């Protein structure tokens, strides 16, 4: 396919083209400012992934359970019958909640690992 | 709390607000230069931290032992009786030594890992 070629495909199918999208995120004052901003934006997403305990990965899962209040739609109903563009609207009011949980259930993990390594 | 809210507290309590501080580090020529510099500064710390074998972590530890000459001040009665601002001055003349050691006792680990993975 190519960049955004999977945009109309289901989430399951589209999850296999993440590499394509990631590689297209990176590369007179108005134009230079646009370039600096593209870098700041990129770095914020990378920082956020690092905070959540998910660094050099395109796909990673965590210990935060899905709350059914966050638009439960079965499971196969989402992955085999919805596009990412639609999913993005289904849970648009919950992303800040989810992100906060993702950060908290990392700090808990880092402390537990630090203590386990202290045992002899 | 909030950004720098734990600045006046002990190292112990302050260690639990690392996420808060990290998120506030990252986001006409002179204004643009300031933004570019902030990015270069950020990246240098991330590079350094990555070289030491500590990548997507706010807390990590290594095999470099603490030397008693580096401001040997107990542990429990100091860690929880001192702020980070104070600690920073207590060892300000040793950070270059420590940083050098952190890199050496990483390069050694990468070579050992590469050799172990070569055992059929």
């Amino acid at each position, epitope marked *: 396919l190519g960049f955004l070629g999977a945009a109309g495909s289901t989430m399951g199918a589209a999850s296999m083209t993440l590499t394509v999208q990631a590689r297209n995120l990176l590369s007179g004052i108005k134009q230079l400012q646009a370039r600096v901003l593209a870098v700041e934006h990129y770095l914020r997403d990378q920082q956020l992934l690092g905070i959540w305990g998910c660094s050099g990965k395109l796909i990673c899962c965590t210990n935060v359970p899905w709350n059914s209040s966050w638009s439960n739609r079965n499971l196969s109903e989402i992955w085999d019958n919805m596009t990412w563009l639609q999913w993005d609207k289904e849970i648009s009011n919950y992303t800040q909640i989810i992100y906060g949980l993702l950060e908290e259930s990392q700090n808990q993990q880092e402390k537990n690992e630090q203590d386990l390594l*202290a045992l002899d | 709390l909030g950004f720098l809210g734990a600045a006046g507290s002990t190292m112990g309590a302050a260690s639990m607000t690392l996420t808060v501080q990290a998120r506030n580090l990252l986001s006409g020529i002179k204004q643009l230069q300031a933004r570019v510099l902030a990015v270069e500064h950020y990246l240098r710390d991330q590079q350094l931290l990555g070289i030491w074998g500590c990548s997507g972590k706010l807390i990590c530890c290594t095999n470099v032992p603490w030397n008693s000459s580096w401001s040997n001040r107990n542990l429990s009665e100091i860690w929880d009786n001192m702020t980070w601002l104070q600690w920073d001055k207590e060892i300000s003349n040793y950070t270059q030594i420590i940083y050098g050691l952190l890199e050496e006792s990483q390069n050694q680990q990468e070579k050992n890992e590469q050799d172990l993975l070569a055992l059929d």
Partner: antibody
Amino acid sequence: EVQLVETGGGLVQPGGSLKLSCRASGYTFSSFAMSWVRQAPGKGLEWVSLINDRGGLTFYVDSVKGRFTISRDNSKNTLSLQMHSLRDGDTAVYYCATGGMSSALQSSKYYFDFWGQGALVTV
Amino acid sequence: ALTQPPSVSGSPGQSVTISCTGTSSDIGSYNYVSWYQQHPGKAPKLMIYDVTQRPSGVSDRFSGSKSGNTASLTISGLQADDEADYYCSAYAGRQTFYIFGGGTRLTVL
């Protein structure tokens, strides 16, 4: 001044369950890791379980590993142990104690500092 | 299990030593071999910790040491007040965590 006081216990028929608990005062509950130690009638002392101070890490002796749960509540200053599938060999006095592992910032102990008097469990 | 079951005794005012023999890695590699004093019907109390330390409230009458894979507790100016069961225990290295010994009873007279 440490006050570790056990409750619960009593006679449970084999295959049954019970919950023990220990309330604590004097010392900041949240500052210490805690354990349960068993005193069988003629054995004296056996370690059973350990929980860290934040209540996130638990360890068990293999013999109760698939049966017992250890838990802490730092707002209540309460330690508890939920026992399931009890056997005759579990008859013992169960002691509440502070000590064992620590936080990695605090000169970990690996010994027990304080003991309660112990709840009696008969199966 | 750590081993120290034989009864122990001695005359008042005389020293007495209670041994604690381990296996290999438990008391050989870890300097975490505490001792407890157990009265017949009371909760035990800590006497010795690490290898040679005592908590406040424990007198100099109680001290101890370790060599090889064997540890010991020594009582100096032995009193009738020392008639208690004694137990040694040690850190096992994260797999079993703690091992208690088969303890022993001290008789003074």
